[PDB]
Ligand binder design. Structure first.
Ligand code: COA
Ligand code: 7DP
Length: 210
């Protein structure tokens, strides 16, 4: 028995404590790199919260057992100056992750897929406590966002998935792939950076039109 609730500003520390226990250690790229202490990822995770569309799953004792942190993304302005997230990151391991994200955005712009959309919901951080996995919590977190989308006239939910394993979860929820890149093909300086286990395959950007 659990609730799905809007994450409030007072929840920041608890959200970070939960992510440090799970996501920081068990998201596939983080585990592959052994991310360790990473204040930059704490900062990254806290950033979308004031957009008021991030959700927590909370058990009957009041403990956070899952989160889906979402932020609004806006179509780049006609005079946009594209910036690399990796350029402002001092943590070498997290820099590799941000560089991968920058590379994906350089190759694929979600706003090209949906020329009429000005605002798209971006699912940034999805994590569920191990003891509560396989119960559909990811789905219930995701579907709470549909409510926000309806309330605000947002049609598209965009979610970068870091493994085929998590892309499959989004597929079950009615998302479809819009871009993919194998880890074996990600060679920004001529060499492979990420070599996690074979079943992960690579990143898949997933989207749903709600
Ligand atoms: C991805 C993640 C959020 C899924 O959350 P979830 O609430 O367990 O999602 P689901 O209940 O839909 O379970 C997904 C699948 O995990 C498998 N599963 C079943 N029981 C499980 C358990 N005890 N533990 C782990 N996985 C289990 C099943 O294949 C299940 O699919 P199915 O129920 O449709 O057969 C979770 O695995 C997680 O936190 N992973 C690590 C962080 C991460 O990679 N986040 C996503 C980055 S894009
Ligand atoms: C929807 C989601 O949780 N995508 C994960 C993307 C991501 C974010 C932060 C990381 O440190 C990382 O390795 C991967």
């Amino acid at each position: 028995p659990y609730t799905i609730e809007l994450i409030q500003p007072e929840d920041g520390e608890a959200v970070i404590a939960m992510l440090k226990t799970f996501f920081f250690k068990d998201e596939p790229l983080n585990t592959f790199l052994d991310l360790g202490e990473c204040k930059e990822l704490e900062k990254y995770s806290l950033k979308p919260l004031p957009d008021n569309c991030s959700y927590k799953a909370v058990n009957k004792k009041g403990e956070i057992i899952g989160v889906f942190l979402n932020g609004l993304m806006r179509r780049p302005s006609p005079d946009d100056v594209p910036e690399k997230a990796a350029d402002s990151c001092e943590h070498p391991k997290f820099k590799k992750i941000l560089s991968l994200m920058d590379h994906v955005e350089e190759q694929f712009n979600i706003f090209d897929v949906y020329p009429d959309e000005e605002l798209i919901l971006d699912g940034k951080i999805l994590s569920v406590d191990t003891n509560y996995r396989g119960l559909g919590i990811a789905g219930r977190l995701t579907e709470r966002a549909y409510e926000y989308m309806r309330e605000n006239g947002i049609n598209v939910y965009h979610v970068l998935c870091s493994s085929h394993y998590s892309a499959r979860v989004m597929e079950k929820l009615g998302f479809h792939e819009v871009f993919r890149m194998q880890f074996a093909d990600y060679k920004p300086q001529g060499e492979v950076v990420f070599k996690p286990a074979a079943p992960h395959v690579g990143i898949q950007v997933m989207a749903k039109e709600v």
